[PDB]
Amino acid sequence: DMKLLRYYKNIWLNNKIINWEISNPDFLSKYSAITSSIFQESFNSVQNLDQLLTDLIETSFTCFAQFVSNKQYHQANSNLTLLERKWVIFITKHLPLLILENSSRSPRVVTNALDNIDEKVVKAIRIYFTEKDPSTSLDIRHDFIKGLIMLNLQPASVINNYLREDQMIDTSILPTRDDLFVRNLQGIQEVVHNTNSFIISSLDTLELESITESITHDSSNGLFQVLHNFESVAPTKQREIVKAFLSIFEDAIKELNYNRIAKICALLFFNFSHSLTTILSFSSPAALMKTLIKFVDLSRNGRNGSNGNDESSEYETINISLSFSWAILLIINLTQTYGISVVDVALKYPELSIKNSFIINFISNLPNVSDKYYLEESNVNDSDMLTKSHNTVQSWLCDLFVNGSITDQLIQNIETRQLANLIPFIVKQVLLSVEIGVLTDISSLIGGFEYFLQPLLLVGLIKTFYWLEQFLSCVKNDTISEDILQGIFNLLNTLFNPVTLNEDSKAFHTAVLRLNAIPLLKVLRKFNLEPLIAKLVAVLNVSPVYDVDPRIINSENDYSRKQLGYGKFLILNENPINKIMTNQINSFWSLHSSTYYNLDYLFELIELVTPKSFLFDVLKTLEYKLATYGVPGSENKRGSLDSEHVFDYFFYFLVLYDVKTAEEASQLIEYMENNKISILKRHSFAVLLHERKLLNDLALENGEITKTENEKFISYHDKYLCMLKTCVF
Amino acid sequence: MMLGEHLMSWSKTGIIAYSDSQSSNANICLTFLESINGINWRFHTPQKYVLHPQLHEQFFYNISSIHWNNWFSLPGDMLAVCDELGNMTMLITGQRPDRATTYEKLTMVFQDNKIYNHVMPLKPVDKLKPMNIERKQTRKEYNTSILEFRWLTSSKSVIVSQFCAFDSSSNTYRSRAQQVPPYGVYHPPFIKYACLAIRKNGQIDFWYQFSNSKDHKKITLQLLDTSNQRFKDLQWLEFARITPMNDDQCMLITTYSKLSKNISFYKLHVNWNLNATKPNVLNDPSLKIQFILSTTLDPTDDEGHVLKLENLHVVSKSSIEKDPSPEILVLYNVCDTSKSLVKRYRLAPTQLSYNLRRHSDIVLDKKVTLITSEMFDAFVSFYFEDGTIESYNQNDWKLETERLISQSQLGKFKNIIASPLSAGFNYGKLPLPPSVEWMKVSPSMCGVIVKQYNKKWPQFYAAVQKNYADPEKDSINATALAFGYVKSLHKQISAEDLTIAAKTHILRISFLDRKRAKEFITTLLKSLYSFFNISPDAPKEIMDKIITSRPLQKIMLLQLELGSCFSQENIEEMARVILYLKNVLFAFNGVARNFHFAIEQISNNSNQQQNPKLFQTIFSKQDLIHSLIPVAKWFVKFITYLTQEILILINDPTNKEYTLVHGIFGAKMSRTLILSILNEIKKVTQIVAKFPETSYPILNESSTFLKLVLSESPVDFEKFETFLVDVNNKFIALCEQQPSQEREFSLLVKAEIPPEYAKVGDFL
Incomplete structure (x- = not known):
């Protein structure tokens, strides 16, 4: 009963932390109703607020303990750290606020909560830190108490209670006020009394050149200092800062202010000191996606009311081009590393035109470019546009490779969407021609590729880098002479190492090289070679990269006698898929091993084996273990109630992998009782169970299946519904 | 769940070897068709055998796939079965170490675990004494789990026929036979045989035997030839379909790795004779691999409904067709909709002034649960949920059972017929797939084999025709069944399935008018002589x-x-x-x-x-x-x-x-x-x-x-x-x-x- 409660609560917290639902004001209500939902019988106990906060404290600490103490059994390079940073952010940011506006400011309850923990967590944390590395080794408990001090929750005499008996902390040194302090140009810590005004004032005077070249922290801009010093922000103030961006960003879309839109996207993309992760950890990524995709979709109507007959048009067109081009880079970074799908948001919001959405089909075909150039895709049945489609290709090739200048007429007559596909087409044709031997002059091309770096033509580089590895992978296996190979690097180095960069293109060029750097580095090392890796490692070191082996980035001289793994999930012959899933069967059945409570290592494992084979190889294999060994935890093989709770562990886990939000549960109950519902959950178990339920019922009318077999299958189905309806999601 | 596409194999000589999953003492079964009293037919008594890795001198494992060597022009007697553990067991029938025997008695060649030669004649389980062997279930998909098995043909050529047309000038049907030169990879005569298997981890195998020796040799590689073993053991291929291409000694290993979520393409090259200047020195063939292309799947349709890849079946296309590029048929199902979309792609080289060119999209009104490609017929079979089967021809993807209605009759060649299915002989209400262990359309498409859970014996369903009371259609039907045998003899198929279907229609005719049925036989057999260019x-x-x-x-x-x-x-x-x-x-x-x-x-x-x-x-x-x-x-x-x-x-x-x-x-x-x-x-x-x-x-x-x-x-x-x-x-x-x-x-x-x-x- 207690074990059931703790398992259910740990999996519930893990799922809710993954699902970005911390910002939901229903967190405490669901956490309180967990106890009543788990026990079918009525449990009418008045749980006081201190009890709720204490339960949250030990639940979070034990969950983090298991999360960090299950990592040694993983592969040493099966690196997934998004959830680790997510735990850190939650425990250091939200729980202090949860106490702040949920607690009664009782110092005793905090002492009881942090004194009731086992020493196993402390021993494991210290052992792991020592193995990774006396040097200052602070734990997550110190950061928890420090945040409470800034909120006036506890006096400065409380931190000394939990400190080691030999080392104290000076009370005066610890910050005690929640006011923003920034180092000015003269070194005085200035008080930022107003947050929104500070952002807009700095944003207006912000320079796009100061993004990556300003390695030093002594920058005159206060806002840029905050990004590199993001780890020390006050607990309550960062919520205001995150909310400040949202209100400012939504207003910029309404007013069509192109200057501030492009600058904002540059800060968020690079993710200095884990800046972007905290943003999703406060606003829901769905709402952020909706406004962001509205701009990229509704921008079509904005080009029919502007006439290029003013000297500010070239300023505006560059401002328009960069505002649109940067907004694309924000989506790709979110989709690739942060695990968000563009298709899902269109289904949830009916106001988005799926069939007429250019963004949706662009991302899914990002690494692949069409061999033919089409001005419009929905009207391929017409030939009038195809006549001038070839005209555009020859017009741009002659002007950029022979004339050496870009006429203003070409830019005005073409849209950004055609440019996003025109640039990959031309570079592919030129690069392919060079490789075969059609093009033999390099020097004219080196200057030619310089024109792709202008602010007007910046959006054309997004698809250029993705195609490179597919181009390079064939090159790696194919036999290419060094004379051609050194030429390929010469043409490539022009895009990689420009001689000069404009004040609006230097940060953009680094940003695009950061999206698809990792697979490029692996292919390049398989072979003027060093500068490309030197440039690639330089742009990889500007900010941390998630789920990457740090040995790969700095493998210049380190030789640890262990082969590097470039992927999130890695498998060897010594530890094949059999051993891990046999250890999963030992955990799916007897809850052995230590790979559980790790949805990083399990969700990817499910996909690698597919939900069908994952469920098929465990459901029917359970009987063999059950028929011989028996139900663990009971010394008597009497009754099926003991085995009933064991089945609840397996079915409750599958529910969370299917249901992700609150209102979604109320609609899946109607799916079972019988269009838009199953669209979002193509790979869910619920679809697989329901599609077989209706199909075998059809055979029941025709009588090709025994009645006993049909009764067995529905037993699994009704159990899934029964827990779905009795538990609130 | 996907059905057992390779659980059963009809050998070209009539032996039906299928996987057995119910008997506790056997894992494979052998049977064939026999005549009861000259009119009716029945399957032969099942000859059960047990296969375990330790036959060379004890628990046995389940059978994964059965592949008779009936490909191309091979004799079709050497059966090689791959178990769930990945061991490839090769059984030869019709031969004994000391003498020649019938086709229902098995014999071993070699066992793979390292490979060794051990000749031993197998014996049936029922006749054998009760042994201490229990059905251990290998419920784990190992690195060595073979995904797709493919056989290698010899240098012999095969002569078949493509189609026939009605010559209105002579009021008779005329057929033309075109020789089919070998395409893809073929093993030389001095090698007794060769075969290829792709394992689920990407490791490849190449078993071969020298015609002048008894010892067997194996050569193994891996697809991802990276410098790190970390990625070597990662390629968990969901689908690995091997389609030989007209390129010499080349097989297109079309794989779909869910790790990278892209349909990666590969090319495999083999040199049969490394040293042509030394014919006496028989060198082992060299194996080479070269990565080619990788593409991503489309997420949505034109109207805004998302898609899910259900299956990836690529057709084995020869050089006869207009565009020899293999058809990558990536199946998609629109969720909560009865429609099912089959997008078609073709692989072509990139031309200057490779890539995948999209031809068209085909919508089907029912969900598909199984796809099986016919051999020497060029027919993709769509086993829908309701039991109906709609076989689309490879040439034009026009429904074969409805081609006559929609055929443009006017022209030089009229009434183009390729199989008896073109006449209108449609299968009845087949049992629902949930109750069915596995299905397989018969080689002549005259009927379907269904294995049932509660039926200890295989069933059989034949084709029926609703308009049997119309006498004017007897001229077409006799000619259609006449050409059905023409292809069968050229492919050395027994065609016992076609014989049963013809008799049932004749029996229904004789029930009403006995005189009419006699003339049906005379016209039917007459067309055989004209088709084969033999004149009595x-x-x-x-x-x-x-x-x-x-x-x-x-x-x-x-x-x-x-x-x-x-x-x-x-x-x-x-x-x-x-x-x-x-x-x-x-x-x-x-x-x-x-x-x-x-x-x-x-x-x-x-x-x-x-x-x-x-x-x-x-x-x-x-x-x-x-x-x-x-x-x-x-x-x-x-x-x-x-x-x-x-x-x-x-x-x-x-x-x-x-x-x-x-x-x-x-x-x-x-x-x-x-x-x-x-x-x-x-x-x-x-x-x-x-x-x-x-x-x-x-x-x-x-x-x-x-x-x-x-x-x-x-x-x-x-x-x-x-x-x-x-x-x-x-x-x-x-x-x-x-x-x-x-x-x-x-x-x-x-x-x-x-x-x-x-x-x-x-x-x-």
């Missing part, structure tokens, strides 16, 4: 070629089964006597050639009489002639039956039940065939008289008895010899009197004389 109205030179032809062993067998229900009818009797005369032909002339060579061996081997080899040679000379005596008794007993009917028919010429006597004499080659038998009989007796046995008088009994049985026959052979000779001359002058080609068919098959030639019947 040709001059006598071609007639000798007909007797030695294999098809008469099968085309005559057709009426042996299609005419069984007709009691007291001579349609089957006429075919059997000619067929048995062929067996009678193999008796005398089969040994007349053998006996002739024994004459020369006597003279040249007369210089060593005391050697221990001549004594056995001498004994065998006079023993062989003894075994012919029982055959000669039936030979005399046969000619008396026809002579007896002569006396009976004279008194009552109006008896229709004794019309078989007319056809026997009417057959043109039979009169010559018996004359040839009488000729060699005279030659044998003359040779025996010229060269009698003198060393041992006791051995002369067999030679003397041969003379006695001929002289003591109740009817003199010389008088009977002139009987058939005179019939031939009279039946030739009648052809010049009036030209007719149906009389040749009538005297050979119908065993009757047309009413327009009633005067000819009185002469006999």
Whole structure:
């Protein structure tokens, strides 16, 4: 009963932390109703607020303990750290606020909560830190108490209670006020009394050149200092800062202010000191996606009311081009590393035109470019546009490779969407021609590729880098002479190492090289070679990269006698898929091993084996273990109630992998009782169970299946519904 | 869940080897079709066997896939089965270490775990003693789990037919056969055989055996030839379909790795002879691999409905078709909608002034649960949920069962028919896939095999036609079934499935009008001769070629089964006597050639009489002639039956039940065939008289008895010899009197004389 409660609560917290639902004001209500939902019988106990906060404290600490103490059994390079940073952010940011506006400011309850923990967590944390590395080794408990001090929750005499008996902390040194302090140009810590005004004032005077070249922290801009010093922000103030961006960003879309839109996207993309992760950890990524995709979709109507007959048009067109081009880079970074799908948001919001959405089909075909150039895709049945489609290709090739200048007429007559596909087409044709031997002059091309770096033509580089590895992978296996190979690097180095960069293109060029750097580095090392890796490692070191082996980035001289793994999930012959899933069967059945409570290592494992084979190889294999060994935890093989709770562990886990939000549960109950519902959950178990339920019922009318077999299958189905309806999601 | 696409395999010789998952003592089963009482059919008794990795000297594992070597022009007897653990067990049938055996007895070649040679003849489980073997379930998908198995053909060429058209000028159907040169990868003659298997981890295997040795060799590689073993053991391929391409020694390993969520393409190259300058030094083939292309799948349709990849089946396309690029049929299902979309892609090189070009999209109204590609037929089968099957042709993706309705009749070639399915013979209400363990359309598409959970025996469903009351469609149907066998013989298929389907339609015809059904047989078998460019109205030179032809062993067998229900009818009797005369032909002339060579061996081997080899040679000379005596008794007993009917028919010429006597004499080659038998009989007796046995008088009994049985026959052979000779001359002058080609068919098959030639019947 207690074990059931703790398992259910740990999996519930893990799922809710993954699902970005911390910002939901229903967190405490669901956490309180967990106890009543788990026990079918009525449990009418008045749980006081201190009890709720204490339960949250030990639940979070034990969950983090298991999360960090299950990592040694993983592969040493099966690196997934998004959830680790997510735990850190939650425990250091939200729980202090949860106490702040949920607690009664009782110092005793905090002492009881942090004194009731086992020493196993402390021993494991210290052992792991020592193995990774006396040097200052602070734990997550110190950061928890420090945040409470800034909120006036506890006096400065409380931190000394939990400190080691030999080392104290000076009370005066610890910050005690929640006011923003920034180092000015003269070194005085200035008080930022107003947050929104500070952002807009700095944003207006912000320079796009100061993004990556300003390695030093002594920058005159206060806002840029905050990004590199993001780890020390006050607990309550960062919520205001995150909310400040949202209100400012939504207003910029309404007013069509192109200057501030492009600058904002540059800060968020690079993710200095884990800046972007905290943003999703406060606003829901769905709402952020909706406004962001509205701009990229509704921008079509904005080009029919502007006439290029003013000297500010070239300023505006560059401002328009960069505002649109940067907004694309924000989506790709979110989709690739942060695990968000563009298709899902269109289904949830009916106001988005799926069939007429250019963004949706662009991302899914990002690494692949069409061999033919089409001005419009929905009207391929017409030939009038195809006549001038070839005209555009020859017009741009002659002007950029022979004339050496870009006429203003070409830019005005073409849209950004055609440019996003025109640039990959031309570079592919030129690069392919060079490789075969059609093009033999390099020097004219080196200057030619310089024109792709202008602010007007910046959006054309997004698809250029993705195609490179597919181009390079064939090159790696194919036999290419060094004379051609050194030429390929010469043409490539022009895009990689420009001689000069404009004040609006230097940060953009680094940003695009950061999206698809990792697979490029692996292919390049398989072979003027060093500068490309030197440039690639330089742009990889500007900010941390998630789920990457740090040995790969700095493998210049380190030789640890262990082969590097470039992927999130890695498998060897010594530890094949059999051993891990046999250890999963030992955990799916007897809850052995230590790979559980790790949805990083399990969700990817499910996909690698597919939900069908994952469920098929465990459901029917359970009987063999059950028929011989028996139900663990009971010394008597009497009754099926003991085995009933064991089945609840397996079915409750599958529910969370299917249901992700609150209102979604109320609609899946109607799916079972019988269009838009199953669209979002193509790979869910619920679809697989329901599609077989209706199909075998059809055979029941025709009588090709025994009645006993049909009764067995529905037993699994009704159990899934029964827990779905009795538990609130 | 996906069905068992490779759980069962119909061997080209009729053996149905399928996986067994219910018996606790066996994992494989063998059976075949047999006739109950000449009319009905039943499957043979299941011959259960047990396969475990430790047959070389104990728990056995489940069977993953069964692949008969029926690909291309291979003999189709060497069965190699791969278990769930990844061990490839090769079983040879029809051969024993010491002698030759029938097709229902198995034998091992080698076992893989390292590979070693161990020849051992397997025995059935039921006959074997109770052994200590339990069904251990390998519920783990190992690195060595073979995804797709493919066989390698030899350098032999295969000749098949593509289609037939109705020649309205002659009001007859015409077919053209085109030779198919080998395409893809083929193993040289000096290698006994070769095979390829792709494992789920990406590791590849290449088993081969040298024709001059018994030891087996294995060469293994991995697809992802990276410098790190971290990614070597990561390629968990969901689908790995190997389609040979027209490129020399190349196989397109179309794989879909969910790790990178892209349909990656590969190319595999093999050099059979590394050192062509040293033919004597047989070097191991070298294996090479080269990455080519990778693409991402489309998320949505045109109208805004998302898609999920259900299956990735690429068709094995030869160079015959207009665009030889293989069709990558990525199936998608629109969720909560009965529609199912099948997007088609083709791989083509990138041209200057590779890539995947999208041709079109095809929408199907029902969800698909299984896809099986037909062999040597170019037919993709869509096993929908409701049991209906819609086979789309590879050429145009036009439905075969509805092609006639939508065919543009006007043109030079009309009524293009490729299979009996084009006529309209649609399968009935098949059992629902949830209850079905596995399905497989029969090779001729005439019926479907269904294995049921509660049925201990395989079922069978045939094709039915709703408009059986319309008499005008008999002309098309007979021609459609005529071409069904034409493809089967060229592919050396038994085509027992097609025989059952033809009889059921004939039976329904005979229930209403018995007269109509008889004409259906005559028209049906006539089209076979036209399709194969063999003419029973040709001059006598071609007639000798007909007797030695294999098809008469099968085309005559057709009426042996299609005419069984007709009691007291001579349609089957006429075919059997000619067929048995062929067996009678193999008796005398089969040994007349053998006996002739024994004459020369006597003279040249007369210089060593005391050697221990001549004594056995001498004994065998006079023993062989003894075994012919029982055959000669039936030979005399046969000619008396026809002579007896002569006396009976004279008194009552109006008896229709004794019309078989007319056809026997009417057959043109039979009169010559018996004359040839009488000729060699005279030659044998003359040779025996010229060269009698003198060393041992006791051995002369067999030679003397041969003379006695001929002289003591109740009817003199010389008088009977002139009987058939005179019939031939009279039946030739009648052809010049009036030209007719149906009389040749009538005297050979119908065993009757047309009413327009009633005067000819009185002469006999």
